[PDB]
Ligand binder design. Sequence first.
Ligand SMILES: CC(C)=CCC/C(C)=C/CC/C(C)=C/CSP(=O)(O)OP(=O)(O)O
Ligand SMILES: CC(C)=CCC/C(C)=C/CC/C(C)=C/CSP(=O)(O)OP(=O)(O)O
Ligand SMILES: C=C(C)CCOP(=O)(O)OP(=O)(O)O
Ligand SMILES: C=C(C)CCOP(=O)(O)OP(=O)(O)O
Ligand SMILES: [Mg+2]
Ligand SMILES: [Mg+2]
Ligand SMILES: [Mg+2]
Ligand SMILES: [Mg+2]
Lengths: 295, 299
Amino acid sequence: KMEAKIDELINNDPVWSSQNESLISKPYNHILLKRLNLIVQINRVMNLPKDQLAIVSQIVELLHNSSLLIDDIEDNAPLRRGQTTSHLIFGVPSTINTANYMYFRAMQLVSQLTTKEPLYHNLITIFNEELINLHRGQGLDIYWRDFLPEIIPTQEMYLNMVMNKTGGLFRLTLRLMEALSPSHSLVPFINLLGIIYQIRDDYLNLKDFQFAEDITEGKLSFPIVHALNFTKTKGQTEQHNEILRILLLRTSDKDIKLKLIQILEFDTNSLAYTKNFINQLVNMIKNDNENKYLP
Amino acid sequence: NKMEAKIDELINNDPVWSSQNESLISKPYNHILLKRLNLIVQINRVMNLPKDQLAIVSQIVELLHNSSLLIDDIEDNAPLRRGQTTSHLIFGVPSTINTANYMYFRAMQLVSQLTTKEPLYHNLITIFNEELINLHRGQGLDIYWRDFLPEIIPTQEMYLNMVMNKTGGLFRLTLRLMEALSPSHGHSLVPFINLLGIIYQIRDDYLNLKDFQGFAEDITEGKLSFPIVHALNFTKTKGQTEQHNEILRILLLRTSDKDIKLKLIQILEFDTNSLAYTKNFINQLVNMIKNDNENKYLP
Ligand SMILES: CC(C)=CCC/C(C)=C/CC/C(C)=C/CSP(=O)(O)OP(=O)(O)O
Ligand SMILES: CC(C)=CCC/C(C)=C/CC/C(C)=C/CSP(=O)(O)OP(=O)(O)O
Ligand SMILES: C=C(C)CCOP(=O)(O)OP(=O)(O)O
Ligand SMILES: C=C(C)CCOP(=O)(O)OP(=O)(O)O
Ligand SMILES: [Mg+2]
Ligand SMILES: [Mg+2]
Ligand SMILES: [Mg+2]
Ligand SMILES: [Mg+2]
């Protein structure tokens, strides 16, 4: 009877049940109890039909939530949107696998946006290209952090890193939408929005504390990049080294975290230099009277 | 206004990526390379893809398999792979996950160098997508059963389904890509490749302990391997309560103590007779192929 069961098995597609699907989805569902608006809004110009716009939205939602699951493991984050990160509940093993599984489920949804073989290819190429960019950006962010102080990035290296890491999903959402549109490309505008988005995230992480987790993580955030480069240039060796020492401590010590922020506030004035940089990027749009970036 | 021109030149160009940066993030992958082409070569005696196309299928499968291992070793807390220190322990779990995930997309990107025919490309991508989904399903079950033990004690049937997904995934991927590219051949060889993946996994599980009675790292990992699955079901079934619980206890210690690992192996050897059951089960599967004159599995 043994041979018979093996025969049945190898001749059928692999078995997968609804219950199993549930087991593997747990780390993902956990983060769901936590961007669409932007798609809505941009559609007032792309006017994709609603059921197709929904799939796009579902694809962006899978990639985004899955990327955070992985990012929190990569950043040793204890919290995300006020709750315990999934890896601390389901373990790093299941969370990595679930997140990665969701990347491929998102991919499968791509083949359901169209049956037109020419267009499908483009949708897949876009998906593939931006996922590649996302990992390149994320890899560099991680590399600088984990090899510190081997390489201290410049503002320009940081901006290119951000174009990959944060612009990736913004560009993916948008490029899909433009290729599907039944009706000037908006990628430049979405690139700039991604950059603004990331620098703002980096700024707020320190400003709402002054958790300041970026310090505990030892992240080469926009203000840290500024401060490190500012002290190096003004030959303020000791402050330069003090910033590195605190980042390398990977500390959760509130007093130490505060010490580093005061360095950026009083010494380099990096927080105020960032605030101004963000405003300078937003003004590039507030003053886009020629509508060169805006629609 | 120069910063503005700078911001303007950037957002209006593709993101910048150097070969230097490509090397820096490829470290985890390059390390595992220092450690498959035969089975592809044989099957091609049947499929006959031109050599240049067969070399791309090969690079794809090589990228997926290697990246798969990088990830698997993090998931299994493995200190060694092919006799060498695991990449996550050298470059860290963060870079290793990211790099392995990056290589999954590099592999996907290669699917396009295989054809210029749109209908076929679409099929190659679907196969790629399908089996990667299958791989993650099996791997997800292997991991859940282990980290949540004893929430679920898988039966022999459940383990085989998990392995059909987990190990048979890459085998089927490679074969389905080749069958779809073949310009040449008979009944699909999928059932045979499924059997090969199943025999392959059970052998991996078996050897992992028989070579200790290697370092029986599957025990330290707490893996619901084929012999362990037999032992846990056999004990429940035979009323060996204390033994059933002791198997669970050892698995949950995640121990590196060789005597404790050795006690467990001898429990499988003399008490549940799981090692012999597995050896014989392997033979019986191998016998389904060898005793195949009507070629219902083999080409
Ligand atoms: C599927 C997909 C989009 C990408 C795949 C590769 C990955 C994981 C990219 C990272 C994407 C994200 C959310 C980056 C922000 S890290 P951060 O600096 O924002 O850390 P934080 O958001 O502040 O916690
Ligand atoms: C991209 C791809 C191929 C798969 C994606 C999903 C993954 C990571 C599947 C895992 C497949 C492998 C190599 C498992 C080995 S654990 P084991 O029980 O086989 O023991 P081992 O470490 O291999 O000896
Ligand atoms: C990964 C970064 C930098 C932010 C992504 O969007 P948000 O994280 O700010 O939005 P939600 O996940 O809270 O929905
Ligand atoms: C169960 C899996 C996937 C690994 C088994 O050994 P491999 O066939 O992977 O051997 P090498 O990759 O080390 O050559
Ligand atoms: Mg993070
Ligand atoms: Mg991060
Ligand atoms: Mg393993
Ligand atoms: Mg494993």
